Design a binder for this molecule. Structure first.
Ligand SMILES: *Cc1cc2c(cc1C)nc1c(=O)[nH]c(=O)nc-1n2C[C@H](O)[C@H](O)[C@H](O)COP(=O)(O)OP(=O)(O)OC[C@H]1O[C@@H](n2cnc3c(N)ncnc32)[C@H](O)[C@@H]1O
Ligand SMILES: *[C@@H]1O[C@H](CO)[C@@H](O[C@@H]2O[C@H](CO)[C@@H](O)[C@H](O)[C@H]2NC(C)=O)[C@H](O)[C@H]1NC(C)=O
Ligand SMILES: C/C(=C\CNc1ncnc2[nH]cnc12)CO
Ligand SMILES: *[C@@H]1O[C@H](CO)[C@@H](O)[C@H](O)[C@H]1NC(C)=O
Ligand SMILES: *[C@@H]1O[C@H](CO)[C@@H](O)[C@H](O)[C@H]1NC(C)=O
Ligand SMILES: *[C@@H]1O[C@H](CO)[C@@H](O)[C@H](O)[C@H]1NC(C)=O
Length: 479
């Protein structure tokens, strides 16, 4: 029904391509790869899976395979090459609404294309990821976080409705008003309940430009307090985007230059500052203001802060250029063969009450005396902008920090041990963190991740929507 039409491929090249991911650490060969030309092909697969006794195959939905640890694999199963849904010229897979208040996007579509289509209509999504070559379905199955999330919530907080094909092979439109149980489960649901074939994304009138600043600190307490100041509810302050980064002394000059923000002259000034203060760690707030008026607005905001005088660094760019900033980093690194390497990334949400402790143990502790390659990102988020009824798991405090330690790799074994050590420190310190973008490998770890109540709901939704436990087996929750 599909294979004869050429859609279900079992050839070595197809299986190999769906057997690795961005993490470049784990691999798992599928039995087959589906290249669907339309959503009907997905309905056909999932309906067959549902109706066939002794159905053999788990099913994963490969967005662009940006997973770190095999989350998009179907070991001895079927990987869906989602990108195939966007092959045809017509009909379009991205539709900005007639009134420009939302954009409908295929689950397979990448956010960079969503941006381009939105900007053509003078609008843009309000909540992003740092890196735009990720699918709508993929980020929504996790959360989708960046510097706008403090004020707009993650991408899962900016979805009006979705089309989902469940594990029963039923096409279902869901929202807060209709099939809300599926809507809530799928968002941050780690691909466990069905495939998002369409998501309705909130947009706002597109800003033309961004005033883009980096502020330098040697004092973590001042750094974090200022981040919390900028992201505090008043309604929010003027900043459109707030992130931060950590720079360890040993690789200070290198890591500062690797941001792509600081000139060599800028780097020298910061190194000299760190030197005079004998600082083992340097911190930088990264913030934007979307828009002489900008000058005074910026000056007013900066006047509330306590960064080191002389260490505010400014850029002014087109909005789209800011949003796609990391693409240029990829192009450059890929030329030097430094993009397609093992990525033992550590991502977590750390409660505000323990962020200073984390800094002491990790940034001032474990990571000291190493050559770090890749950004160490740290910034506060507001729990109020997250829907706890959705599958995504966050710490219990009103404010928690996104902590993204994006190590690029004999280096691999060292970094894997280092990440275990960081987690060990957190566990022993009693820090109630939640992992993000990580898969756990036993029941107890997953139950702890979700917490008792949310786990029980997660299981209830699994029984309802994927009773055979076929979907996204690489998450290792029910597989
Ligand atoms: C590669 C990477 C990832 C990344 C990032 C930068 C880079 C270079 N920056 C991020 C950021 O700033 N903020 C954020 O929240 N995430 C960021 N990421 C991580 C990224 O979100 C994840 O990798 C995510 O998985 C999206 O990647 P992708 O779209 O390629 O999805 P996948 O890896 O193939 O699949 C992940 C899981 O989701 C399920 N899935 C995929 N599509 C669907 C649909 N349409 N419906 C239901 N489930 C889906 C897969 O089965 C898999 O389990
Ligand atoms: C974008 O809008 C178009 C309507 O112009 C949608 O295209 C239709 O899609 C359905 C089912 O997918 C087909 O039966 C119709 O033949 C299509 N109509 C036209 C005019 O081509 C398209 O599905 C929309 N895309 C998304 C992701 O919502
Ligand atoms: C994975 C996540 C963020 C990644 N952010 C990045 N931000 C800036 N540059 C990069 N290069 C690779 N990843 C990045 C989630 O917080
Ligand atoms: C990682 O990438 C390299 C290419 O640099 C490849 O040879 C290797 O098989 C990959 N490993 C995994 C597990 O993806
Ligand atoms: C799923 O399978 C059941 C039989 O177990 C059947 O009654 C139902 O119609 C099926 N749904 C679809 C859409 O295949
Ligand atoms: C920073 O690292 C360099 C070696 O790269 C070292 O010479 C210097 O003492 C370090 N500074 C501090 C204050 O730790």
């Amino acid at each position: 029904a599909l294979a004869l039409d050429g859609k279900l491929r079992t050839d070595s090249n197809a299986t190999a391509a769906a057997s690795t991911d961005f993490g470049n650490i784990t691999s798992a060969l599928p039995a087959a790869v589906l290249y669907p030309s339309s959503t009907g092909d997905l309905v056909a697969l999932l309906s067959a899976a549902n109706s066939t006794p002794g159905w053999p195959y788990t099913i994963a939905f490969r967005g662009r395979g940006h997973s770190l640890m095999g989350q998009a694999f179907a070991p001895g199963g079927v990987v869906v090459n989602m990108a195939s849904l966007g092959d045809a010229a017509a009909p379009p897979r991205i539709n900005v609404s007639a009134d420009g208040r939302y954009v409908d996007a295929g689950g397979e579509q990448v956010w960079i294309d969503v941006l381009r289509a939105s900007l053509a209509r003078g609008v843009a999504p309000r909540s992003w990821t740092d890196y735009l070559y990720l699918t709508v379905g993929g980020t929504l199955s996790n959360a989708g976080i960046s510097g706008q999330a403090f004020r707009h919530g993650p991408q899962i907080s900016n979805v009006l409705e979705m089309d989902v094909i469940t594990g029963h092979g039923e096409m279902v439109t869901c929202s807060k008003q209709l099939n809300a149980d599926l809507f809530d489960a799928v968002l941050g649901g780690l691909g466990q309940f069905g495939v998002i074939t369409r998501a309705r994304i909130a947009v706002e009138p597109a800003p033309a430009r961004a005033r883009w600043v980096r502020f330098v600190y040697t004092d973590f307490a001042a750094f974090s307090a200022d981040q919390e100041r900028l992201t505090a509810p008043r309604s929010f302050g003027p900043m459109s985007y707030v992130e931060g980064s950590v720079f360890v002394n040993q690789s200070l000059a290198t890591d500062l230059a690797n941001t792509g923000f600081f000139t060599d002259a800028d780097v020298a000034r910061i190194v000299a500052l760190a030197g005079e203060r004998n600082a083992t760690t340097v911190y930088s707030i990264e913030a934007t203001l979307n828009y002489a008026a900008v000058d005074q607005e910026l000056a007013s905001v900066l006047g509330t802060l306590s960064y080191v005088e002389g260490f505010a660094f400014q850029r002014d760019v087109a909005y789209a250029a800011f949003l796609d900033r990391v693409h240029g980093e990829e192009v450059a690194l890929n030329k030097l063969g430094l993009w397609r390497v093992p990525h033992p990334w550590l991502n977590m949400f750390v409660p505000r009450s323990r962020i200073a402790d984390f800094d002491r143990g990790v940034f001032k502790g474990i990571l000291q005396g190493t050559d770090i390659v890749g950004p160490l990102i740290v910034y506060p988020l507001n729990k109020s902008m997250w829907d706890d009824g959705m599958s995504a798991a966050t710490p219990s405090e009103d404010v928690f920090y996104a902590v993204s330690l994006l190590f690029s790799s004999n280096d691999l074994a060292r970094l894997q041990e280092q990440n275990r050590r960081i987690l060990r420190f957190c566990d022993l310190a009693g820090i109630q963190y939640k992992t993000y973008l990580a898969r756990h490998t036993d029941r107890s770890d997953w139950v702890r991740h979700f917490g008792a109540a949310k786990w029980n709901r997660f299981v209830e939704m699994k029984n309802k929507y994927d009773p055979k436990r076929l979907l996204s087996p690489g998450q290792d929750i029910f597989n």
